[PDB]
C-alpha cells in the first residue's frame, strides 16, 4: 500500500496495450508491480539508457525498438513500414502486456496508436481527438496526415492469418 508513480502521459489503449512517456526510476514500480509488462516497444533511434536496461534485465522484460526520427529533418517524415513493424510487435499476444513509449509519448507514440485505432475501424475524428488530447500543446498535423494516409491492408492480412484482430477490451 505504498506510493506508486505512473509515467507522464500514461494511458491504456486497448486490452493489454499501454502508452506512456519515457519512464524514469520512480515509474519502475508502476511498470513492474502493477502492470507486470512482458515487453516494451521504444521508438527512439538513440541507444536505450543503461539504468533502464538493467531494470529490464531484472524483470525479464524484452526490449523492442523501432527507431523513428524525432525531426532529423525540417518537419518531418515517419515511414509506414516502421509503423507496420511496430504493429506486428504490439498486436502479437506473445509480447503483451506491452508499453509503447517515446521521448514524451506524444508524436511517435500517438501516431502508432492512431493507426491502432484505424485497425479498430474508429472514425478519424475520435482518432484525431485522442491524438490531440495526448499531444497537447505540440500537436502536429503531419502526424495526423501520417495516420490518415497509412495503408493498413498488409497489417490486416497479417492479423487475420494469425488471428490477432479483433482487438479485445
- CATH number of 136's domain: 3.90.190.10
Structural domain count, the chain: 1
Phi/psi of residue 30, nearest 5 degrees: -70, -35
List the strands of the sheet with 62-65, edge to edge.
Answer: 11-14, 17-20, 98-101, 39-42, 62-65
Experimental method: X-ray
Spatial separation of the C-alpha atoms in residues 8 and 28, rounded to whole Å: 13
Spatial separation of the C-alpha atoms in residues 88 and 66, rounded to whole Å: 11
Q: Which residues have C-beta within 8 Å of that of residue 35, sequence separation ≥ 6? A: 18, 97, 99
Coil/strand/helix, residue 23: coil
C-alpha cell, 32: 513492474
Count CB-CB contacts under 10 A for residue 13.
Answer: 20
Element (H, E) at 81: helix 80-90
Is 98:18 a contact under the CB 8 Å cutoff?
Answer: yes
∠ CA 93-109-78, nearest 5°, is 110
Q: Residue 10 sits in which domain range?
A: 1-169
Partners of residue 108 on adjacent β-strands: none
Spatial separation of the C-alpha atoms in residues 90 and 88, rounded to whole Å: 6
Q: Give me the resolution in angstroms, 1 decimal.
A: 2.5
Amino acid at each position: 500500500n505504498k506510493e506508486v508513480i505512473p509515467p507522464e502521459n500514461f494511458s491504456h489503449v486497448v486490452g493489454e496495450i499501454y502508452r506512456s512517456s519515457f519512464p524514469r526510476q520512480e515509474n519502475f514500480s508502476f511498470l513492474h508491480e502493477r502492470l507486470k509488462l512482458k515487453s516494451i516497444l521504444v521508438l527512439i533511434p538513440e541507444e536505450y539508457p543503461q539504468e533502464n536496461l538493467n531494470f529490464l534485465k531484472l524483470t525479464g522484460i524484452k526490449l523492442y525498438q523501432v527507431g523513428m526520427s524525432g525531426n532529423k529533418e525540417p518537419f518531418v517524415n515517419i515511414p509506414s513500414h516502421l509503423l507496420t513493424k511496430a504493429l506486428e510487435i504490439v498486436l502479437n499476444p506473445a509480447n503483451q502486456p506491452i508499453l509503447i513509449h517515446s521521448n514524451r509519448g506524444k508524436h511517435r507514440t500517438g501516431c502508432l496508436i492512431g493507426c491502432i485505432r484505424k485497425l479498430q475501424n474508429w472514425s478519424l475524428t475520435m482518432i484525431f481527438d485522442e491524438y490531440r488530447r495526448f499531444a497537447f500543446p505540440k500537436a502536429r498535423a503531419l502526424d495526423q496526415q501520417f495516420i490518415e494516409m497509412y495503408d493498413d491492408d498488409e497489417i490486416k492480412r497479417i492479423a487475420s492469418k494469425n488471428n490477432w484482430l479483433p482487438l479485445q477490451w
